[PDB]
C-alpha cells in the first residue's frame, strides 16, 4: 500500500506528479553530499539525495524513512531547514524511455558530520561532498541540484 | 491530464495527490469557502483548491485552478506561498472504499468579489466567512479550519 509494485508505481508515475523530499545536505566544513545516481531518472548525473513521499504517509514520517534510506542515518522533520517547494521534470523514468516522470519538490537542508552517515550503495554508485562553486561548475551535477546553490 | 475514471482511482488508492488550496480574502477582512458536492469533504464548507496534474507546472496550474475555483484567472505571481499541508481522507472522489491524501501548497490573495464568477460544479453555495465564524463552526472542515488557527 506504501511501497507500490511495479504495476502500481508505472501507472502512478505515467498519470500523476510524485511528491518527493530533496536533501541539502552540509557537512562541518561547508561541503554538501552529491551521490552518483544509478536509477533513472537522471541516471549518472550526481544529484542530491532523496526521495517520493508514499500514499497515506506523513510529512514527517516520510522525512525520517527518507533520511535512513538515503544517508544510513534517520533524522526528524524538526532538523530540517524548508528550502522551498521546486519542480523537476524527466523525458525518462525509473522503467524506461516509454513516459516522463514529473516530482513536485519539497527542499530541506541540514548538517551533519560525515563519520555518523552510513552511505548506502543501492541508489548511487558514488558520493562526494562538494562546494558550492564546484558543484555548479561542472555539467555532471544536474540542473536539478545546481539550482539549489 | 484529467485522468479516465480508471486510472484516476489507481491514482488515488496508490500515491499522494498534490493540490493548491486558495486563501481569498475580500475587501471585509473574510475569506472564501463553498460548501463542497464532492467527496472527499463532501457537504463541508471548504477553501477553493484543486489538484495539479501530469506535467502540470505549478505556474500553469494556478492560472487553471482559479480560473476553475474562481471563476477569475490569476497568475502565481498574485500568491503569496501559505505553506505545506497535508489533507488524509477516509473516502474517495467516487466511493468510500479507499483513502485519499493531499500534500497541499496553500496561497493567500485577496480579490474583488465583483471580479470573480464563482462556478457552481463543485460548491452548491458560497460565503465570506471572518476567521472567528469559520473557526466556530464543525461545518467548516477541519483541514479549512487550520488555516486561520
Ligand atoms: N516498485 C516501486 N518502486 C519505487 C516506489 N517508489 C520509488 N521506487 C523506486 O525506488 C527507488 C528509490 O526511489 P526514491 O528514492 O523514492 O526516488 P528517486 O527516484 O531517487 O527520487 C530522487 O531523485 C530524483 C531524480 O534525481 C529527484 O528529482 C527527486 O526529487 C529525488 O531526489 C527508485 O529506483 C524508484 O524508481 C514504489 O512505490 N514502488
Ligand atoms: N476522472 C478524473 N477526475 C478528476 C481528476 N482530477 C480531479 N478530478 C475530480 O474532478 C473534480 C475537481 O477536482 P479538483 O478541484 O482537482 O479536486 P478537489 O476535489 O476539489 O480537491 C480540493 O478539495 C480537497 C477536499 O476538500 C482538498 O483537500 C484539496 O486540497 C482541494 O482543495 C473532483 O470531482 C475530483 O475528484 C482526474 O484526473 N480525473
Ligand atoms: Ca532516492
Ligand atoms: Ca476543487
Known amino acids: 500500500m506504501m511501497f507500490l509494485r511495479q ?3 508505472a501507472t502512478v508515475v505515467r498519470s500523476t506528479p510524485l511528491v518527493s523530499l530533496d536533501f541539502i545536505v552540509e557537512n562541518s566544513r561547508g561541503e554538501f553530499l552529491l551521490g552518483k545516481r544509478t536509477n ?3 541516471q549518472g548525473y550526481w544529484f542530491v539525495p532523496g526521495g517520493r513521499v508514499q500514499k497515506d504517509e506523513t ?3 516520510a522525512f525520517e524513512r527518507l533520511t535512513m534510506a538515503e ?10 531547514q524548508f528550502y522551498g517547494v521546486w ?4 523525458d525518462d523514468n525509473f522503467s524506461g524511455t516509454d513516459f516522463t516522470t514529473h516530482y513536485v519538490v519539497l527542499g530541506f537542508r541540514f548538517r551533519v558530520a560525515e563519520e555518523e552517515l ?5 541508489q548511487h554508485d558514488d558520493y562526494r561532498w562538494l562546494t558550492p562553486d564546484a558543484l555548479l561548475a561542472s555539467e555532471n551535477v544536474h540542473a ?3 539550482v539549489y546553490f
Request: net charge negative; aromatic share 10%; no cysteine.
Open 118 to 122: 552510513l552511505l548506502p550503495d543501492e
Open 59 to 61: 510529512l514527517e514520517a
Open 87 to 90: 519542480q523537476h521534470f524527466y
Open 71 to 80: 544517508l544510513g542515518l534517520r533524522l526528524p522533520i524538526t532538523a530540517g
Open 7 to 9: 504495476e502500481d508505481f
Open 144 to 146: 536539478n541540484s545546481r
Open 40 to 42: 533513472r531518472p537522471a
